[PDB]
Design a protein around this ligand. Structure first.
Ligand SMILES: Cc1cc(=O)oc2cc(O[C@H]3O[C@H](CO)[C@H](O)[C@H](O)[C@H]3O)ccc12
Ligand SMILES: Cc1cc(=O)oc2cc(O[C@H]3O[C@H](CO)[C@H](O)[C@H](O)[C@H]3O)ccc12
Ligand SMILES: Cc1cc(=O)oc2cc(O[C@H]3O[C@H](CO)[C@H](O)[C@H](O)[C@H]3O)ccc12
Ligand SMILES: Cc1cc(=O)oc2cc(O[C@H]3O[C@H](CO)[C@H](O)[C@H](O)[C@H]3O)ccc12
Lengths: 15, 133, 133, 133, 16, 14, 15, 133
């Protein structure tokens, strides 16, 4: 796909 | 709660949040940097009011966040983010909100927080962070 | 020419450029993706006018650029980008301009063009591309 | 302790660690992937012996870690990593060690752990992770 | 998606 | 610095 | 410099 | 010819290639950096002999490649890499080979070449570069 990706960390909190 | 996802940007210029010491984090909004200019992110607001406002204005690009930490816990039967702290290379902002419940912390040795996503009901239910070089 | 630098975004939705058969590429503007929403880039315009406009509308996000090619050569004493071609996974757009002089080409095996920078005087003098995953 | 830094690789094939049910994490070694082939990392050893070894063998590349969690706290007057758990998209490995002290956890929504660095004396003193797409 | 980390690659130049 | 970095290739042209 | 960089999170633990 | 793919590393310490002043590039081999240690890449050998070797030893990590350029053209009826030049922040190495046919160039404004892949028969058929921050 033509969409750039980034690292994401988390989530913290509720489900 | 209502999910939000700001996506990823070039950096962070300011964070406006709110909290109540009886409960948890409420509102959350961020002015990001986008390729040199301020980008005013949407204000993700609690469904209620009564919160104390906090404005964390960073000396961008000299100043950047090196650690985000906080507490999650049960408020009135809901697991929410009760407190947040933002440490930069210049000083510490927070804690905001009561430091009770289960701690978490994300120190960054190399890299940058460049975005936030999450969900806010009465309180900030959960959040995640975009990281980049 | 006047230097320009859009910086980096999430992807590309449309490219608008202009060219003249007698000379070289004139104006250049990109509609980027930014976190799933269109972001209309600055329009980088020639100091002069009379060029033929072209609009390349990509079917974002399934369509993306896989190769950018072109020619550089002398026009009225200036070495400029005389021609551009953009190849996607779907089709080829171009060549636009004059295919004379020294060729160049950047094919991409893995990754995405997410921004442009360069300089435009009477014509597009040169340009560079931001690449990301 | 002795500091160690494996640097960054292409992903993770195995983790070999050791622990003691009364104390903390002792030894830590990783078999990384490097460009499709195993790379056997340095074995980072505790100054003492007597630990229970565990081998965590991942079905690389389809199985990868999505969360690292554990506890830090005091052992003989030193803050050390008392417990680790590694959650993949397939299974949970752990907890290994003693689950008391202060919890921490790094869930990953997008991206991979590609390296570890840290320090080990009698026990794992601290550690960091390299993250990459 | 995968346990394999990704890298930008440009090219190839030469025969196609 | 606080500014995110990206690979940049080029310039072509001059 | 000629050394490639990567995001690094942590440390957790002492110090 | 025979495909090769070194993968991606942390940097480049040395490039050992061979070429013929009357034909194209032949053998290609790279000593990479891998987290501070030399990584001796496989030697990718031409199917034939009669080349002149060259050793490009870089002052890693202070010296690094800023532009790879060269020429592709016909040799015995095959499109091959006829010539290569490596410019670093310190000096220029090359041209090696025959400076004829269709030019190409990959200048880098930000980032690093961290790997090569390609194919070699009697001469270097084609190649690609891994780029990273
Ligand atoms: C404290 C309290 C008082 C009240 O009258 O109603 C609610 C309702 C709540 O639910 C919403 O907020 C939650 C926490 O942020 C969560 O998002 C939930 O899905 C929402 O419905 C919470 C607290 C109340
Ligand atoms: C008077 C005149 C006539 C002509 O045909 O071309 C030019 C170009 C000029 O320069 C501007 O465009 C250049 C090529 O793109 C370059 O960027 C330069 O820096 C611009 O000022 C000026 C006058 C012309
Ligand atoms: C339990 C115990 C007993 C003893 O006689 O000496 C030591 C020394 C210790 O310190 C070493 O391990 C620490 C935690 O891993 C830390 O690395 C320190 O720098 C080491 O020298 C620990 C325990 C002891
Ligand atoms: C000069 C020459 C003479 C001949 O009779 O056969 C060949 C075959 C060649 O092919 C090999 O090298 C090519 C270019 O490097 C390409 O890789 C091909 O697939 C190889 O088989 C080359 C030269 C010849």
């Amino acid at each position: 796909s033509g969409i750039s990706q980034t690292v994401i960390v988390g989530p913290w909190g509720a489900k | 709660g209502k999910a939000f996802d700001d996506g990823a940007f070039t950096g962070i210029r300011e964070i406006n949040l709110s909290y109540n010491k009886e409960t948890a984090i409420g509102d959350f909004q961020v002015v990001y940097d986008l390729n040199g200019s301020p980008y005013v992110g949407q204000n993700h607001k609690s469904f209620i009011t009564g919160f104390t406002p906090v404005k964390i204005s960073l000396d961008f690009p000299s100043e950047y966040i090196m650690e985000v930490s906080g507490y999650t816990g049960n408020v009135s039967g809901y697991v929410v983010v009760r407190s947040l702290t933002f440490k930069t290379n210049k000083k510490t902002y927070g804690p905001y909100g009561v430091t009770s419940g289960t701690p978490f912390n994300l120190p960054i040795e190399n890299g940058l927080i460049v975005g936030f996503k999450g969900s806010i009901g009465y309180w900030l239910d959960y959040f995640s962070m975009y990281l980049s070089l």
